């Protein structure tokens, strides 16, 4: 899509429609005449394009109006209202730009932000841009949170986020033009390699992949069409649903075997009845022929009754010989109507052991994409975000994803090594108490108008709590925290002296032996400039490999690789790293999934701020004081960098609207 309609799409908005967010601010326009809406819409899109065309520099309300034309550049309160809404919600001038109008010398409102994950950083940058006094508290000794980039010598490999999932309407698209990230495209090609160490052949490969996607569509049909969504009071998982489909496929394989072998019997049994008939005819014949012989003994000449006798018996013998000819005829049709069916059995099994194994690898691919046992994902909703896929080739950040949070961190007040312990929010303000992770008795307190909590969901999840809210978060929020899923996935990084794999290929499966190990080192990546291979540990395996040492892991890795490229083509790895996200106390996992009995709507509850009770009773309703951003809070873009980055933008907008007010709604 291109022009001003490209921009609308590249900023994730309908180019010819006003969004529910716009209605909110422009209810004059959207409840008014069509004509104006289109003017509005244009102004919007136009502006978007401008910022998009050049995101290394700030887009001012002047610069905008300059480059508009009549009739559009005619109403300036409109233009202004639009430009300001855009800027407010981070649709323009987000990320890293040269400012023209240097910063508001004195600040307004004060905000503490928990965590310098990307959601964190993105929100800070906004708030600071909006003239606010912003400080972030990171427990770790680096920014970037779950964007971890391993660096040593020339080796570079993310144990965290690693891929940009297409630039097609991706905020990261913008960020990438603003920051020296080096984006290589990932080539889609992916050979699998069963346990033995030898490729699966195109034949199988394709027939199984196709059956897998066939089995997905299926589950979906159970969900929406058949409404199969509760099972003895428990929400139905995707895992379960897949089984129920697989069974019903195994069953029909048998129902078919049964009926085809039942045609055989119903037939082979006419044959019986006919063979019988026929054997009783050879009987009456044999004996009739006897009789006619006896009657041709009576040598001529002979009285007529005796002559009649021969003739009679003759006709009778011929009659019966017609008949047995007609039956030998029949016998002949059925006799081949059996070498018929017996030649076309139906299919023998539903799927073989070699099949069900490759099919597993396809389930590992799901578990990796949802960082969880499919036994846990919601049937109705696991994929509830699919409509918002980006377009274009997925990509890697050849100089390491960290390069981004770090970029975003510049200009910012970030207290590193500071572990929030308590959030205290009240009608008149908030204080956050944090310790120093080095010497923990050493205490800190921050007073602020507002707190933005970007705590990872696994953190928010700790029993017993690692962070205490004072007062306790209302039950609607904590239930959302329980209901939601926060999964796990790990990475193994392999550094070598030399490339010993297919240089022109970026990924390649390893099919496991069991259902149980389906995710164990199931997938490898040749992504980087240096000789580095990287392998996923996913599904059930993820959780259990954390309990195993690095060597015993790197072993199984080398094992598999030898297995695939030959025992002596695979050298001892110079450097090795192994992620353990569930263990990591500042993650307690890797990213969220919609768990069974959750919906996408829970993500919405994650984002709803908290408004304290009043101090003095009978005093009016307070401002909201506790806000949340982060991958677990963005229904439309869960579990991802852009998703987070986007929630950061979102809260910063909402908080600024709250404490600096919004001049654009008038």
């Amino acid at each position: 899509p291109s022009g001003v309609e490209g921009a609308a799409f590249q900023s994730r908005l309908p180019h010819d429609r006003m969004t529910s967010q716009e209605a909110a601010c422009f209810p004059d326009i959207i409840s008014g005449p069509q004509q104006t809406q289109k003017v509005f819409l244009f102004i919007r899109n136009r502006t978007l394009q401008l910022w998009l065309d050049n995101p290394k520099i700030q887009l001012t309300f002047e610069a905008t109006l300059q480059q508009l034309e009549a009739p559009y550049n005619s109403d300036t309160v409109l233009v202004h209202r639009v430009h300001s809404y855009l800027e407010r919600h981070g649709l323009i001038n987000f990320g890293i730009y040269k400012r023209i109008k240097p910063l508001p010398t004195k600040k307004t409102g004060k905000v503490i932000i928990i965590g310098s994950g990307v959601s964190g950083l993105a929100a800070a940058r906004q708030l600071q841009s909006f003239g606010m006094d912003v400080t972030l508290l990171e427990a770790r000794d680096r920014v970037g949170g779950r964007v971890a980039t391993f660096r040593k010598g020339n080796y570079v490999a993310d144990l965290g986020a690693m891929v940009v999932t297409g630039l097609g309407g991706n905020p990261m698209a913008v960020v990438s033009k603003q920051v020296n990230m080096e984006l290589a495209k990932i080539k889609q090609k992916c050979p699998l390699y069963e346990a033995n160490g030898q490729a699966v052949p195109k034949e199988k490969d394709e027939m199984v992949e196709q059956e897998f996607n066939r089995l997905l569509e299926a589950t979906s049909y159970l969900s929406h069409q058949l409404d199969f969504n509760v099972l003895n009071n428990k929400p139905v998982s995707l895992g379960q649903a897949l089984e129920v489909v697989i069974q019903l496929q195994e069953k029909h394989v048998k129902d078919e075997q049964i009926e085809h072998w039942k045609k055989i019997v119903k037939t082979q049994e006419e044959l019986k009845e006919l063979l019988n008939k026929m054997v009783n005819l050879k009987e009456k014949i044999k004996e009739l022929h006897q009789q006619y012989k006896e009657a041709s003994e009576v040598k001529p000449p002979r009285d007529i009754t005796a002559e009649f006798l021969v003739k009679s018996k003759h006709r009778d013998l011929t009659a019966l010989c017609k008949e047995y000819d007609e039956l030998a005829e029949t016998q002949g049709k059925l006799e081949e109507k059996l070498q018929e069916l017996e030649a076309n059995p139906p299919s023998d099994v539903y799927l073989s052991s070699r099949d069900r194994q490759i099919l597993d690898w396809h389930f590992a691919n799901l578990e990796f994409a949802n960082a969880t046992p499919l036994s846990t994902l919601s049937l109705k909703h696991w994929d509830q975000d699919d409509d918002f896929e980006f377009t274009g080739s997925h990509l890697t950040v050849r100089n390491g994803y960290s390069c981004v949070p770090v970029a975003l961190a510049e200009g910012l007040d970030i207290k590193l090594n500071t572990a929030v312990r308590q959030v205290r929010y009240t009608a008149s303000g908030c204080e956050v108490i944090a310790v120093n992770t080095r010497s923990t008795s050493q205490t800190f307190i921050y007073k602020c108008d507002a707190v933005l909590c970007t705590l990872p969901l696994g953190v928010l999840k700790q029993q017993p709590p690692a962070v205490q809210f004072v007062p306790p978060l209302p039950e609607w929020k904590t239930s959302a925290v329980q209901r939601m899923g926060f999964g796990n996935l790990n990475k193994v990084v392999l550094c070598f002296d030399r490339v010993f794999w297919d240089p022109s290929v970026n990924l390649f499966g390893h099919v496991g032996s069991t259902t149980a190990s389906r995710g164990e080192l199931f997938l490898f990546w040749n992504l980087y400039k240096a000789p580095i291979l990287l392998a996923l540990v996913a599904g059930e395996a993820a959780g259990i490999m954390e309990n195993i040492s690095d060597d015993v892991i790197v072993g199984r890795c080398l094992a598999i690789l030898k297995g695939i490229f030959g025992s002596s083509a695979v050298p001892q790895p110079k450097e090795t790293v192994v992620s353990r996200w569930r263990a990591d106390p500042w993650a307690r996992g890797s990213y969220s999934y919609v768990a069974a009995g959750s919906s996408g709507n829970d993500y919405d509850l994650m984002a709803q701020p908290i408004t304290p009770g009043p101090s003095i009773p009978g005093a009016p309703q307070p401002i909201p004081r506790l806000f949340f951003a982060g991958e677990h809070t963005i229904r439309n873009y869960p579990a991802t960098v852009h998703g987070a980055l986007l929630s950061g933008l979102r809260e910063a907008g909402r908080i600024a609207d709250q404490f600096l007010g919004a001049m654009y709604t008038l």
Partner: peptide, 16 residues
């Protein structure tokens, strides 16, 4: 989420 999937992208149960 499906959207995470880079390698052999699941097709099934999708609105293409």
């Amino acid at each position: 989420a499906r959207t995470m999937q880079t390698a052999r992208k699941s097709t099934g149960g999708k609105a293409p």
